[PDB]
Design a protein around this ligand. Sequence first.
Ligand SMILES: CCCOC(=O)NCCCC[C@H](N)C(=O)OP(=O)(O)OC[C@H]1O[C@@H](n2cnc3c(N)ncnc32)[C@H](O)[C@@H]1O
Ligand SMILES: CCCOC(=O)NCCCC[C@H](N)C(=O)OP(=O)(O)OC[C@H]1O[C@@H](n2cnc3c(N)ncnc32)[C@H](O)[C@@H]1O
Lengths: 255, 255
Amino acid sequence: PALTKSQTDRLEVLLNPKDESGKPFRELESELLSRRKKDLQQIYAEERENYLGKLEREITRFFVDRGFLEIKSPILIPLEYIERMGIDNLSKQIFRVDKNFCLRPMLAPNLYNYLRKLDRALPDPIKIFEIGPCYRKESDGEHLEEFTMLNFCQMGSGCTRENLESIITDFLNHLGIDFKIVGDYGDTLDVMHGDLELSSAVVGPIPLDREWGIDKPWIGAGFGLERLLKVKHDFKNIKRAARSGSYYNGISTNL
Amino acid sequence: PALTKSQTDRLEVLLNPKDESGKPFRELESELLSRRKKDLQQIYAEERENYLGKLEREITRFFVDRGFLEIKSPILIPLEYIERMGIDNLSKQIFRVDKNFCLRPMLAPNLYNYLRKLDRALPDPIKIFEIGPCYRKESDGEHLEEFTMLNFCQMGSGCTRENLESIITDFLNHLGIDFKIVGDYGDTLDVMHGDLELSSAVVGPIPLDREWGIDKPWIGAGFGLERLLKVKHDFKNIKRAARSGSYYNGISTNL
Ligand SMILES: CCCOC(=O)NCCCC[C@H](N)C(=O)OP(=O)(O)OC[C@H]1O[C@@H](n2cnc3c(N)ncnc32)[C@H](O)[C@@H]1O
Ligand SMILES: CCCOC(=O)NCCCC[C@H](N)C(=O)OP(=O)(O)OC[C@H]1O[C@@H](n2cnc3c(N)ncnc32)[C@H](O)[C@@H]1O
């Protein structure tokens, strides 16, 4: 009669945010399975684009159109970059590779490097952004160990908290994601969606800048793409938005 | 009078495939520096798109339009997948992470998984592709340790060597890359550009398939994006096309 907790989990896996007691487990499952196969069939026949890849392309067009240079830097970076970011023995939340490298847990390091180098060639202000894989050993989850970050930044003139909030606002209203900016330069703003942190943004300059050869004011923000997708598609668990073999655009692939 | 080998290397770094003795090093360098800054300035003012990111988007549109489903799977995969690919103690060319994972050296594993799972929901034939970071400890270089692979595959009907060659041909003529297919099912074709291997393609089925729960015929090919860019932009060294802090669209960032 009553579904076991295990059966309920199984059905939840097959449940979509938009689906709407009695009937036995096998029938409820057979029903959801047919719906999910049809969903996949519709995607394969029409769209064919992956949510994460498509979001990245949409975000890229948004920043490129607003004057930001598109950066693609290494994912495997020197461990020294992590120390240089002020993270000495969070240090174990780092995925290490070999003796001197690791999987970037964030984008700041390579972006700092580009800001410094580009300043010798580009007119002020320097505007850049990167979208790509970042890695952090996790606990909760909202928390993926493998995720995708969008980090944009501007250095030089126009680097005010007001301009930063304006970019964030246009960006999220563009994506159709509800949010609230919270704070109270050297400032740190938290872009929230309910209790979920969408982004921790900062208005420089900050003491860390010196360690990277940066001496100008700057503004920047980092957003996790899977979180945006989770909020956007009303996914209950963020793993439905992650690179995975278990879900395709939020649809279970275990059919 | 004569440039030292070190000065020549420096100038080569600043040299673009399209630039065309006497003058002293400092003057030759100052000349190249101004040109490179202008190049970067033109990119920042107009395009703003990264070569690698832009190629990925172009390849994606190409396969999506031809009926292939866009896949974004994990970059950090179980070490077991490598053994399962038939690579037992090349095994040390693998970047290991923690005790049970590694950085994917290729895309086949996750694509095999998707072919198996999608077959339970999608009509024949199943066509999918992925574009993303792959990692392999290297020696030569043509050889990056961090690169980007495009792997597409079709399973079920239509999986002939002829159809495979046709896709490869349309793809490369589309990108404007000269090539030659060489070979002699269970077939392996090498797509060459002069002496450079652009892709090692295969016509299944192959014995390995069974280990992945795949029992249908299939065709597939893997192309390294940095190599395509290298050939396309006539870069002398492939590192000019890689994710890097040292080059931006083939232009030195050490100005
Ligand atoms: C000049 C250049 C230097 O720029 C900076 O130094 N800082 C720019 C300000 C941007 C913040 C920085 N990129 C950052 O990493 O903030 P934080 O680490 O708290 O993470 C920001 C966002 O990444 C996402 N995120 C994090 N970990 C996860 C996870 N495990 N799963 C899913 N989503 C996640 C989430 O959106 C989180 O709010
Ligand atoms: C059903 C699914 C299973 O599909 C398959 O099992 N096989 C599909 C056939 C595709 C070949 C496979 N993806 C592969 O990896 O072939 P191979 O490892 O020789 O590499 C293919 C290409 O990757 C590129 N590549 C490699 N290593 C580098 C490097 N270090 N720097 C730069 N470029 C590089 C280069 O283009 C090379 O030819």
